[PDB]
Amino acid sequence: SQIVLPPHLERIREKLAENIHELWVMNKIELGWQYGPVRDDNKRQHPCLVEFSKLPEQERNYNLQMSLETLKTLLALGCHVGISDEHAEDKVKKMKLPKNYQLTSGYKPAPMDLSFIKLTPSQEAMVDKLAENAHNVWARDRIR
């Protein structure tokens, strides 16, 4: 609770939300998970294959907020944000991913910059602690 969202971090909050929405849309459309624009709870139709606006905006705000406590947990563990420059902020490359691994709309698949960045073992340990805390939060929500 004590963590307050900074403007620098909320600038990329919505980009992270769009990226994770990309994760759900492509993962569903690739694993063959059922497509439905309508919220039909009976035959298991999932609206996670829809454009941002026509996506259930309650779910989209859920994703935006989930990003928020992701940022807040990451800052609270002991990782401090540092902005390099607006040039590296602009630096991003769009992969060429076809319609099969693309969502139904024409939003070009562009998750992430696979070119030069590598994964640190310390970053992996941090993300492990992040998943630990997220699972703990979800379990406490279920207990409530």
UniProtKB/Swiss-Prot annotation:
Expression sites by tissue: Detected in heart muscle (at protein level). Heart muscle, brain (cerebellum and hippocampus) and placenta.
Localisation: Sarcoplasmic reticulum membrane
Repeat region (Sequence), residues: 1-97
Origin: domain of life: Eukaryota
Secretion signal, residue range per the UniProt entry: none
Post-translational changes noted in the entry: Channel activity is modulated by phosphorylation. Phosphorylation is increased in failing heart, leading to calcium leaks and increased cytoplasmic Ca(2+) levels.
Disease affiliated with this protein: Ventricular tachycardia, catecholaminergic polymorphic, 1, with or without atrial dysfunction and/or dilated cardiomyopathy: An arrhythmogenic disorder characterized by stress-induced, bidirectional ventricular tachycardia that may degenerate into cardiac arrest and cause sudden death. Patients present with recurrent syncope, seizures, or sudden death after physical activity or emotional stress. CPVT1 inheritance is autosomal dominant. Ventricular arrhythmias due to cardiac ryanodine receptor calcium release deficiency syndrome: An autosomal dominant arrhythmogenic disorder characterized by syncope, cardiac arrest and/or sudden unexpected death, often in association with physical exertion or acute emotional stress. Patients who survive manifest polymorphic ventricular tachycardia and ventricular fibrillation. Unlike typical catecholaminergic ventricular tachycardia, arrhythmias are not reproducible on exercise stress testing or adrenaline challenge.
Record note on domains: The calcium release channel activity resides in the C-terminal region while the remaining part of the protein resides in the cytoplasm.
Protein name stated in the entry: Ryanodine receptor 2
Species name: Homo sapiens
Source species taxonomy: Eukaryota, Metazoa, Chordata, Craniata, Vertebrata
Gene (UniProt): RYR2
Residue numbers of the full-length protein present here: 870 to 1013 of 4967
